[PDB]
Amino acid sequence: NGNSLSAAELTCGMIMCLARQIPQATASMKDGKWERKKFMGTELNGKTLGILGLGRIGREVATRMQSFGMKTIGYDPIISPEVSASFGVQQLPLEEIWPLCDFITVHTPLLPSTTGLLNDNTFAQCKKGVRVVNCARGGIVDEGALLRALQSGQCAGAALDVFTEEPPRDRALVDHENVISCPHLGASTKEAQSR
Amino acid sequence: NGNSLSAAELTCGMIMCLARQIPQATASMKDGKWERKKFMGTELNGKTLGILGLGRIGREVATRMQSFGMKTIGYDPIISPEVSASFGVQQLPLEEIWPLCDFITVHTPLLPSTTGLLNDNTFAQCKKGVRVVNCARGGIVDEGALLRALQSGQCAGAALDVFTEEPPRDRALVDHENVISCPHLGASTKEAQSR
Numbered sequence: 001n002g003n004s005l006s007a008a009e010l011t012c013g014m015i016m017c018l019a020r021q022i023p024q025a026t027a028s029m030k031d032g033k034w035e036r037k038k039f040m041g042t043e044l045n046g047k048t049l050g051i052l053g054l055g056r057i058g059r060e061v062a063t064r065m066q067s068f069g070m071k072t073i074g075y076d077p078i079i080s081p082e083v084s085a086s087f088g089v090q091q092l093p094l095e096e097i098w099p100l101c102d103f104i105t106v107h108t109p110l111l112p113s114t115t116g117l118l119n120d121n122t123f124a125q126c127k128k129g130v131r132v133v134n135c136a137r138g139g140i141v142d143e144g145a146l147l148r149a150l151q152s153g154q155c156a157g158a159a160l161d162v163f164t165e166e167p168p169r170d171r172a173l174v175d176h177e178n179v180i181s182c183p184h185l186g187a188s189t190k191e192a193q194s195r
Numbered sequence: 196n197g198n199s200l201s202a203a204e205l206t207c208g209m210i211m212c213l214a215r216q217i218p219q220a221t222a223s224m225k226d227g228k229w230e231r232k233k234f235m236g237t238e239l240n241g242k243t244l245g246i247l248g249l250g251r252i253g254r255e256v257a258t259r260m261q262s263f264g265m266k267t268i269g270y271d272p273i274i275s276p277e278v279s280a281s282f283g284v285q286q287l288p289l290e291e292i293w294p295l296c297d298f299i300t301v302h303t304p305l306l307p308s309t310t311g312l313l314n315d316n317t318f319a320q321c322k323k324g325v326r327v328v329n330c331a332r333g334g335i336v337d338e339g340a341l342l343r344a345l346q347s348g349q350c351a352g353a354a355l356d357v358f359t360e361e362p363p364r365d366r367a368l369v370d371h372e373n374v375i376s377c378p379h380l381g382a383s384t385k386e387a388q389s390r
């Protein structure tokens with residue numbers, strides 16, 4: 001609540017990082033390389049962002065990404081479509097969301113219904129090259145499924161602030177060239193800490 | 196013109212990268228580490244962003260960063276203050292700008308007046324801990340001065356897409372822990388390439 005904006009900002013930063021590969025570019029540059037072709041990226045303007053979970057953080061993500069000309073769609077079983085309309089998010093059933101999304105971001109608790117919200121069945125229904133963000137709770141994105149999706153190219157990149165186990169003991173995601181990551185920094189700001 | 200949104204989008208990415216140290220955090224995770232204290236960051240909401248150069252790219256940065264609640268101030272020799280106000284940028288003489296800014300971003304051409312726009316004189320007029328972005332042209336930020344300001348703490352972080360020499364021959368800037376960088380990727384998007 002006091003940390004909604006810290007979470008929402010981190011999420012939007014991860015979205016920009018997946019579009020432009022800024023973390024990977026910095027690593028390259030620090031290793032003395034000048035790799036222009038490798039880090040050809042994409043524009044956010046005109047892309048579709050799916051927001052799973054339309055509480056405080058999700059809404060704050062939406063209105064920030066709207067300023068980039070992203071089309072913002074989403075799903076929340078609790079929040080009315082009239083409330084989500086108020087902040088520019090079209091609610092759609094999940095089955096409709098997957099095929100539309102260039103980017104998908106998750107803003108849910110960890111429940112039975114949301115553990116593996118993104119899993120092999122839902123990755124399959126996504127547009128090829130979807131990019132995924134999890135700054136919410138470890139386990140919302142099935143980590144096995146995500147790796148399989150990165151391996152095939154069904155998922156073109158992922159940004160993870162949270163893991164099923166913290167620190168993650170399985171390193172295959174964190175080591176993947178298309179994965180950007182942080183050690184659960186969503187609420188690690190001077191402001192969130194200090195009310 | 197085509198490439199203005201690519202540049203503006205990178206610049207905003209750089210700004211969020213600087214606020215939450217996302218490239219350094221990924222590098223630390225990739226080094227097998229879980230260092231959360233080290234990467235305590237800052238909220239963008241409420242902070243002041245100084246934009247030097249209020250052209251197309253500068254405007255586009257402003258309206259995106261306005262959605263994060265950033266106060267947007269700036270300077271441009273040509274653009275009148277009532278026109279900048281119409282896109283949310285409060286124009287002030289440079290002398291007024293330096294002490295006010297949490298972040299500064301340059302969007303100027305490279306001219307005698309803008310080469311070393313940021314230099315030892317102007318850095319010492321800044322607020323301690325200012326964060327700086329150059330996705331415009333190498334040399335607008337004097338690189339020697341920026342290094343000294345990073346070494347003292349007067350500058351808390353910088354994000355560079357461009358260098359006085361490309362690739363950079365001098366390495367101290369790129370190698371600094373608080374500097375994030377890319378190999379001149381501001382126009383390197385599929386969309387910008389394609390027309």
Ligand SMILES: Cn1ccc2cc(N)ccc21
Nearest residue numbers: 052053075076108113114
């Ligand atoms: C299955 N699922 C998808 C989004 C979402 C949000 C909440 N609050 C609960 C469950 C959810």
Ligand SMILES: Cn1ccc2cc(N)ccc21
Nearest residue numbers: 247248272303304308309
């Ligand atoms: C000295 N200076 C500061 C900002 C700026 C913009 C332009 N286009 C030219 C010169 C400038």
